Automatic annotation (TrEMBL), chains A, B:
PROSITE patterns: FERRITIN_LIKE
Positions contributing to Ca(2+) 5 binding: 103, 106
Residues bound to Mg(2+) 4: 49, 126, 129-130
Binding site for Ca(2+) 3: 49, 130, 133
Protein name per its UniProtKB record: Ferritin
EC number: 1.16.3.2
Reaction catalysed by this enzyme: 4 Fe(2+) + O2 + 6 H2O = 4 iron(III) oxide-hydroxide + 12 H(+)
Function of the protein: Iron-storage protein.
Compartments in which it is found: Cytoplasm
Residues that hold Fe cation according to the record: 17, 50, 53, 94, 127
Binding site for Zn(2+) 4: 50, 94, 130
Length: 143, 143
């Protein structure tokens, strides 16, 4: 019973979560090249976490009677100017993902799609946590 | 001690294994849309299997002192004309992946990169198995 509009929006987001996963893997390639096994391992966990986010969107879309369409994934950046600069790029990206979700939340509220509104709440909470995990990294590394 | 040429070839293949994973997920979107939960679940296992193939290339490249660079992933097809037509596309794709590996095997033999030659042998064996798993599906579904 999902509108085509809310379905398109959730499919767009599914593809956004796939690119999120690819960017984070890209960041690991930078960390691994620079010898930072530990930051690379962190980025690889994150890349796997975003994939399960994308599959939660995948399965919810089919539960509501929609179809998934996978789009082209753009080439991510492969180099930053140091650790801090990578993680600040991570944080900026997370915040873009959070705004992306909030616009779906708004459209769901508009259409009174109470099931979608409830589905997204988990992703709102998890992005709050992830944004703050990156802030704690940046603070721990300060100066 | 890997040549730039053998490194580029293994990085190209890493990106080929990522697209392999995306094509297989695409095939699942087709199966799931058509109600075939079972063929979709098969394609999702396969997509996850190719990802670990791509990460074996990822970690081997760094073990030999190279860097990974992630490229853009093209949009896969999202529709086939039935089950059999999907799996025949799967088989044709596997065979392209096998030829891709054999050309790396050849370049490794040329450069007497005995470590790469041994690394790829696992992927030669696994593609033989996967190609035959798809043939057994096609035969079981015949007419
Ligand atoms: Fe996410
Ligand atoms: Fe593979």
């Amino acid at each position: 019973v999902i509108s085509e509009k809310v379905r398109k929006a959730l499919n767009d987001q599914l593809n956004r979560e796939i690119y999120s996963s690819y960017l984070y893997l890209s960041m690991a390639t930078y960390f691994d090249a620079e010898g930072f096994k530990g930051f690379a391992h962190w980025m690889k966990k994150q890349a796997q976490e975003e994939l399960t986010h994308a599959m939660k969107f995948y399965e919810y879309i089919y539960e509501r009677g929609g179809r998934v369409e996978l789009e082209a994934i753009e080439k991510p950046p492969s180099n930053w100017n140091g650790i801090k600069d990578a993680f600040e790029a991570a944080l900026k990206h997370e915040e873009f993902v959070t705004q992306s979700i909030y616009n779906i939340l708004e459209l769901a509220y508009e259409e009174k799609d109470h099931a979608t509104v409830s589905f997204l709440k988990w992703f709102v909470d998890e992005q709050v946590e992830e944004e703050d995990q990156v802030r704690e990294i940046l603070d721990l590394l300060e100066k």
